[PDB]
Amino acid sequence: ALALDTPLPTPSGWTTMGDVAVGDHLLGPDGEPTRVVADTDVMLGRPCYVVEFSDGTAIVADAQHQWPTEHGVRITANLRAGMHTVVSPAVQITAVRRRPSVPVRCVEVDNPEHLYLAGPGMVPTHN
C-alpha cells in the first residue's frame, strides 16, 4: 500500500516501507514503539496516488491504502483536499492526484488503533 521509498520512523531512527520487516518496530499514534506483526510482498501494477499534506510532506500510496480522517477511515481513492489525518494541530491533506504505478507494500502493527507514523512528517496512517 505505500511506495517503497516512503520513510517510516522507528525507535532507533528511520527505515523505509521497502526495508521494514515483521518483528521490527515502527511508531504508533502516540509516538511509542509498535510492533510490525504482518506484511505484504512488494506489489506491482497497483494504481498509485500522491497525497500532499499541509506540513510540506507527501506520501505515495495505492488506491486502497487506508487513512484515519475526521470522517472515519477513508481509502486513498476517496481522500479529498481539506480532510485531516487524525489519531482521536492535525495535519491537513492539501492535494490528492494519480501518479504512475510504483511498487508498494503494506504492514500491520499491533496497537489498538492500528496506526503507524509515515513520511518525514510522521503523519498517522492506518495499517
Residue numbers in the entry: 1 to 88, 101 to 139
The authors write:
Inteins are dynamic intervening protein elements that invade at the DNA level and are transcribed and translated along with the host protein. The two inteins in the dnaB gene of M. smegmatis (Msm) are different from each other in sequence, insertion site, and splicing mechanism. The first Msm intein, DnaBi1, lacks a HEN, necessary for invasion of novel sites, and is considered a mini-intein.
To understand the mechanism of disulfide bond formation, a crystal structure of the class 3 DnaBi1 intein was solved to 1.95 Å resolution. Class 3 inteins lack a nucleophilic residue at the start of the intein sequence, instead using a conserved internal block F cysteine (top). The catalytic center of DnaBi1 is composed of several key residues, including the WCT triplet (left). However, both Cys118 conformations are distant from Cys48 (Cys118a, 11.0 Å and Cys118b, 12.1 Å). The thiol sidechains for both residues also rotate inward towards each other.
